[PDB]
Amino acid sequence: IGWRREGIKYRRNELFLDVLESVNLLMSPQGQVLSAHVSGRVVMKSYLSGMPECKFGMNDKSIAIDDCTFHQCVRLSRSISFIPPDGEFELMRYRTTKDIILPFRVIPLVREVGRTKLEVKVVIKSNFKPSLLAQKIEVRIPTPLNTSGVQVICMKGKAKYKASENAIVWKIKRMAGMKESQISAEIELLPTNDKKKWARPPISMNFEVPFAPSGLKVRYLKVFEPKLNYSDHDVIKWVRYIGRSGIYETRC
């Protein structure tokens, strides 16, 4: 054991686990999931007395883990066992594909109005417990290059046209589970080389949510240290879940 020295003490024996996940989606205009996956890591912050034998347990085999590497300290069989390094460290890393919760659904509508206007309406739907708040929401809607001007109306949030980036950017501070919001935009067009079709790129989203899209859930973290005169009941334990978008594109 060259990751942990030997004579460590704390009055207050406490650990913290952070489940951190990226959720990636590509969706067809109809509503097919063309591709989706989740990448995750568990980080541990441990203030435990001595040299303890810990046993981590989650709802494995219930969700399905395609593959996962571990940290040196991990003894391999068939559940997870280790003596943690003190302070903060990455315990495991993992990937997921099956039975993913997709926190948001995006429904685009587009209509051409002669050669002069584009009519665009996008709806977002939150798909998770109403107890829970998504935050830092962005919806990115692309605009053509012959764009003269853009009008938006949105009842929730704020939105501005970013001519430099060729995109309408809609931002929302917080939104609760099982809910609906929509933006309307009218895009004014300059005339153009006639046989330019618009390659309508996807509408993309960013968001953060307080749960693991993978479905993963922490079940126990058991600490035993045989010499010293604390037990398991004496340790204070916490989890938090932080789920964030990676590539989250819906094709309009």
């Binding site: 913290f16 307080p210 922490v218 079940r219 126990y220 973290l221 334990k237 916490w238 989890v239 938090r240």
Partner: peptide
Amino acid sequence: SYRHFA
């Protein structure tokens, strides 16, 4: 948000 396990 840092909650106990159960």
